[PDB]
Amino acid sequence: VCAREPIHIPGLIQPYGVLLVIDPADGRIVQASTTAADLLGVPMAALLGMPYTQVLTLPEAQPFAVDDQPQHLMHAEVRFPQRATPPASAWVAAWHLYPQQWLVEMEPRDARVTLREAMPLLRSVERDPGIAEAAVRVAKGLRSLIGFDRVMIYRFDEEWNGDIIAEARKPELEAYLGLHYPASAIPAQARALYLRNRVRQIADVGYQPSPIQPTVHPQLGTPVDLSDVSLRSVSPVHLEYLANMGVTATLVASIVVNDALWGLISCHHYSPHFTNHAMRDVTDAVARTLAGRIGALQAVARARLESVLLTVREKLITDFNDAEHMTVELLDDMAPDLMDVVDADGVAIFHGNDISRHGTTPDVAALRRIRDHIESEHHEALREDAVGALHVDAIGEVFPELADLAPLAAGFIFVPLMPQSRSALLWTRREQIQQIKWAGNPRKSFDLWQQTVRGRARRWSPLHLESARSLRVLIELMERKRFQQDFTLLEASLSRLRDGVAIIERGTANAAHRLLFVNTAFADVCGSDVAELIGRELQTSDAPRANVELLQDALRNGRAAYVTLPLQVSAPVYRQFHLEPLPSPSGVTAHWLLQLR
Amino acid sequence: VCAREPIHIPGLIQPYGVLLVIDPADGRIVQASTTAADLLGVPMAALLGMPYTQVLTLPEAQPFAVDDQPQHLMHAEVRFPQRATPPASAWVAAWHLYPQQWLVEMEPRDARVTLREAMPLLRSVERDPGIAEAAVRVAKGLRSLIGFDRVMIYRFDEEWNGDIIAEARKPELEAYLGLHYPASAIPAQARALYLRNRVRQIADVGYQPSPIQPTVHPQLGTPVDLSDVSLRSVSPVHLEYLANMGVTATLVASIVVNDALWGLISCHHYSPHFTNHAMRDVTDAVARTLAGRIGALQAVARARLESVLLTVREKLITDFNDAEHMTVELLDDMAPDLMDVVDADGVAIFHGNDISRHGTTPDVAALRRIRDHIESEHHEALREDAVGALHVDAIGEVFPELADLAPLAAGFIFVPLMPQSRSALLWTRREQIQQIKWAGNPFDLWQQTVRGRARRWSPLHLESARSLRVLIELMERKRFQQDFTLLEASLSRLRDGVAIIERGTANAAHRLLFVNTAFADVCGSDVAELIGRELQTLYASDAPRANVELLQDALRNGRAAYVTLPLQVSDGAPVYRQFHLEPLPSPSGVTAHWLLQLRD
Ligand SMILES: */C=C/C1=C(C)C(=O)N/C1=C\C1=NC(=C\c2[nH]c(/C=C3\NC(=O)C(C=C)=C3C)c(C)c2CCC(=O)O)/C(CCC(=O)O)=C1C
């Protein structure tokens, strides 16, 4: 229910500033934060329904009507012409112009050489190499710039769990560096707002919130979507957490990489600390700059991997097409490259009953148990739902029966997906145990935990997975070469027979019934050799109409027939025609087996 | 010789400022620009070998010893304590701290609300869709931020040639937007310096340069590698070019994307214009924000293309495996997706003599001429040197004989690479004529019209092509599979009793590979319960030693034998048939299989 909270419509503001909701039609204040009455000259009752022009004057930029796409005006100087000296501090206002509403949020300008001072840090990360190095540079650098008691770089993992990869802190305190946080700690709804809004600040934990006096819009009958307002009141859940933790102030800048939330810059202050718009802007700069390189390094990295994976993939491809017989020594030369292409610990090549195991892989029968378990009609749902290749990260989770084997086949890639059998490929990564230094929750009591996760292999790279799909052509290549080898066998075997054999291709009624294959035993009985006989119609008068009719009836209706008939010599030669229909998937007779001794 | 100039060690400075080389060992000035003597107070002779501290009055930040990685201090306030009112304008100094040397460059503070003023422009590009929109936004925006007469975004192509993709200029002066420049215009070493040093400016073209008085280091014996120093003197080659062009001032910010020089922000002023420390810093900001967004959009874009090409690729894959017969109507449903996966204008599927041409492709016999031309032993070098698939951008260049056809097959992707025949795939792009609006070396532009070339084959489209090689082997497998199941059914339905014997080795036995029902019945036990059985099992344990020896000798030496022997009977009926074992030919000549015919 907590992971289902609205958070964007609390109907409350952070007291450090004022919020006003203005009807763009008449330019009158429809809703207002309780803090508005004090900053602005006039108390609540009269301030409500009053035009914005009457109570606040701003010289830099003014609001305006928006058509569809909402527009946002940055923080600019705002004055309060309705009171006998109301500036205990300088004030700055930002706008959120919507087609139905205007949202103005104001806060103290504050002050105190910043953007120029940040420049050498930005330049140093941009030229820096490696998420690690940059993350730690940003951590230390931002700790010097904005001055927080804690600056940590929180990286989101694949399942949206966090990890503190970098940290800069006061000499004192206990380092949270290396700590893992669940996905549940930062809900989807919250995460979305960090993308939409780049920098957010909790100025003082346990603030007395300022409610938006007319809770719902007086004419629209809806609450105020504070999704873009920085003054948006935080979840009490999270506030209690921070309070229990001893942290009183918070600055969180979003590390958005390729328009996706890669991670966060988390800043904690164990005393209260409002970070002014100008400073917020600098942290946003460093966040974007950090966000920039990581993506840069991510791009370069990927690029290099693609190239080498391709080189190896193409060798495997050419080497496989080049050899005409799948020898044990061929596969033993193949295996290293075939494991490398998918960065597997071991690979097992299946070819109908036979298994050619290589690298760090389970026993021949254990492998067979895995293939057998996959090929099953119970796990038929998995194979279809699988992209080009079936792959597991923790064998125990998807194949519960197979829960063991995990020390050597913790993860695997299986190709082909079809229960196609005969040829297959099983890539495997052995179990690699993860030591995950978690973090606690319920002010000076703390005991760390350390989950040791067995059964899981190193996660399958999406790039390694496409490298696997890219090698499907070795399976069809194996299969083609196999049938080609088996065919040339039976073709030689039938040609060396004594009992005169020919395969008759059923003409599609239009075309005649013709000779597909004919042996050296059979052609000889006719005289004319095999080459000249392939393609001639079965109709090769003298022959009795009664006998021909029986044979023709079989050809007509796709049935069998045993009939003695004369032939064409180079004695007239009378052999017994044993025409038999060869089975078809359609059930429609497509070919016939003709033999005669 | 020009494309191999040093440029990093000219031994000269831009007169607008002063450069000093300091020995970090005892803080003395070892080398100095001729301009140093005028602003520092003390003339050259005495200024040389003197400690920097005597002429130091820098309060903001000071130099320091470094270990390995050089460090750079930003432009900060510096004063000359040897002269009574030394300047007319404030002076600012930057440091380049190396483990062997310290490089201090100073220049007028100038000034003339800048970094906050730039923030909405950075904001505007960070949100922009597509490179084209961001490039033009940066161009216009930087032209407003600094009053340059010209601001152009120069994009490097695959061959390191440039293209002005964006431009913001004065109402007057002819637009260079759309102009193409050769790779020769910006040499490799020049390009390298734009990567190492992101921002570069020329204050006034045809400046009287300030030489570094002690040309080489007095103790190390090497010249001064400016490389990071903005005051560095640019090539006279390039200066003459700018002068001929009428431009007097420069400002070039590097668009480095994924650690590679993607392009440049070129700024021209037709009058002299020094851009201050605060100034350069803002352009640096916009350059990387622009570089940032370009790479971001590049990433996102690629990501989305990969996903849809995969979906389509997987449909082709499953749809091809699903059908058991390659009908004309199947291929006609396949063709659209099969062309789409590689963004081809037309595709032609070959299957032994037959051709199923689709989309905008040449005539059936013209296609055949292309395949024939590729499959040739003369172009055998091309095929091996290719990656997974053979591909051309301009058919006329690689296959000169095929120079025509270019209107419909200007470019193509051929697969399989092997002269494997029987099954193939020919993707084709028709000729798309390029109008390249070149630039004229010293007002006069040209317009190359390049015919014979198709749109360049995307590396992403090429890997999408390689990814579909499995359709060729799938076609072929299904074909041999069909031909095999034919002969396998034909032999199984025979009367004379036949079995195929697979020869073994030292540890391996001679086993039955294939056995028909006629053969199985004579033994009693069915076909399933016979495949893989050892040949020895079939004859009785009673069998005469004389007869078995003959058969074994054939198996031993891969020869033939015709011997009557009893059969292993479960019941007890003495079944004696003639074993007609014959060796089936092998390419090696070494008997690999035998044909076992059983007739009385
Ligand atoms: C209902 C689920 C939640 C549990 C359990 C919990 O502890 N918090 C829950 C909800 C929310 N968390 C929100 C923000 C948030 N959480 C973290 C977590 C950490 N920050 C750290 O620095 C560390 C450890 C060092 C942890 C584990 C962060 C960083 C943030 C962002 C703000 C901040 O702390 O800097 C959140 C959004 C609040 C809001 O704006 O309404 C919710 C709902």
Ligand SMILES: */C=C/C1=C(C)C(=O)N/C1=C\C1=NC(=C\c2[nH]c(/C=C3\NC(=O)C(C=C)=C3C)c(C)c2CCC(=O)O)/C(CCC(=O)O)=C1C
């Ligand atoms: C030696 C061969 C060269 C020929 C021919 C030529 O035209 N230039 C040659 C050499 C160098 N060019 C260098 C720098 C440089 N080149 C450009 C290119 C252009 N600028 C433009 O505005 C346009 C078109 C509108 C083009 C094609 C620029 C911009 C620059 C940097 C200076 C500037 O901002 O104008 C160069 C390096 C010189 C240096 O810095 O030492 C060399 C050797």
